[PDB]
Amino acid sequence: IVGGYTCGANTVPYQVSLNSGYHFCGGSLINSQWVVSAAHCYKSGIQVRLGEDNINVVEGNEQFISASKSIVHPSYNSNTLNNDIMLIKLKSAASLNSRVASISLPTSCASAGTQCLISGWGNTKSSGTSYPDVLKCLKAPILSDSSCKSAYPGQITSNMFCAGYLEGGKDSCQGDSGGPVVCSGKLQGIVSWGSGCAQKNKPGVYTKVCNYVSWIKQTIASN
Ligand SMILES: [Ca+2]
């Protein structure tokens, strides 16, 4: 997250870190057994880390649970990032508590102009590299479909939305991929892509979770 703030330990209790020997992507806990992340975060050998604040210090509220299954969307296209969504099943259910909690799936799609909370352990520099240890947060508004398509001509599908600031300076970034975009208390987006981070005229692009709720529900009813 570039241009964000330190969230505060465990104030984003649905945020997970995906670890394969090191943090490599975020995700969102949607119930005690399942995490939503980006398909482009797929790796074999994922351990889900819940209850994290500093990902390099064991502070006492973590739960580390291996994935038993990962399910990339059936129509994910890694070239365009259309349908950039994945489900990860935990080998054992998380113990839900004040620091480890699920986020609701949406019923309706979010509205342009809605301010959403985006979080992660990704790079904090637009130019260069610095990865934080503690979880960072950003409030960013959803941009109109027409502004998103103007920013990335020929690249935005109906399964993507843009959020952020066209002047630059505030965005998600590498290492935040797969993590949450929460708007009005529902998981509306997944950190997916963008040109650089926090560059002028190049807002973040996010997987539109409200298009996937029936897939998510049928898949979790069956696995
Ligand atoms: Ca920790």
Phi, psi of 220 (to 5 degrees): -70, -15
Q: What is the enclosing helix (H) or strand (E) of 220? A: helix 213-220
Domain boundaries, given as residue ranges, for the chain: 1-12+103-210, 13-102+211-222
Q: What amino acid is encoded at 190 in this protein?
A: I
Phi, psi of 183 (to 5 degrees): -130, 125
What is the SS3 assignment for 128-177?
CCCCCCCCEEEEEEECCHHHHHHHCCCCCCCCEEEECCCCCCCECCCCCC
Cβ atoms within 10 Å of 60's Cβ, excluding its own: 7
Cβ proximity of 166 and 142 under 8 Å: no
Q: Residue 1 C-alpha to ligand 1 middle, in angstroms?
A: 18
122 exposed, middle or buried (CB, 10 Å; 0-12, 13-18, 19+)? buried
Cβ proximity of 60 and 11 under 8 Å: no
Resolution of the structure in the document, Å:
1.2
| Distance of alpha carbon 200 from alpha carbon 147, whole angstroms | 13
- CA dihedral over 156, 144, 218, 14, signed as positive or negative: positive
Half-sphere exposure of 137 (CA within 13 A, CB side): 16
The separation between CA 93 and the C-alpha centre of its own chain, rounded to angstroms, equals 20
Which tokens hold the place of 92?
A: 């054992």
Cβ atoms within 10 Å of 205's Cβ, excluding its own: 27
User: E strands along the chain, which residues?
Assistant: 5-6, 15-19, 23-31, 34-37, 47-50, 63-72, 86-90, 115-120, 136-141, 160-163, 180-183, 186-193, 204-208
Which tokens hold the place of 128?
A: 């260069």
Question: What's the Cα-to-Cα distance from 42 to each of 45, 85, 124, 201, rounded to whole Å?
Answer: 10, 10, 23, 29
Phi, psi of 202 (to 5 degrees): -140, 75
The annotated binding site for substrate is made up of 171-172, 174-175, 177
Q: Residue 84 C-alpha to ligand 1 middle, in angstroms?
A: 27
Experimental method: X-ray
Partner residues linked to 163 by β-bridges: 142, 204
| Distance of alpha carbon 128 from alpha carbon 199, whole angstroms | 12
DSSP class per residue in 190-211:
EEEE-SSSSBTTB-EEEEEGGG
Cβ proximity of 140 and 187 under 8 Å: no
| Distance of alpha carbon 91 from alpha carbon 50, whole angstroms | 13
Q: Residue 56 C-alpha to ligand 1 middle, in angstroms?
A: 6
Which tokens hold the place of 182?
A: 């929460």
DSSP H helix total and E strand total for the chain: 2, 13
Phi, psi of 149 (to 5 degrees): -70, -35
Q: Which residue has the tokens 């301010």?
A: 115
| Distance of alpha carbon 117 from alpha carbon 23, whole angstroms | 20
Query: Which residues belong to the active site?
Result: 40, 84, 177
- Architecture per CATH, 13-102+211-222: Beta Barrel (2.40)
| Distance of alpha carbon 151 from alpha carbon 203, whole angstroms | 8
Q: Residue 3 C-alpha to ligand 1 middle, in angstroms?
A: 23
The annotated binding site for Ca(2+) is made up of 52, 54, 57, 62
197: phi > 0 → left, psi -120 to 50 → alpha, else beta; which? beta
Q: Residue 22 C-alpha to ligand 1 middle, in angstroms?
A: 12
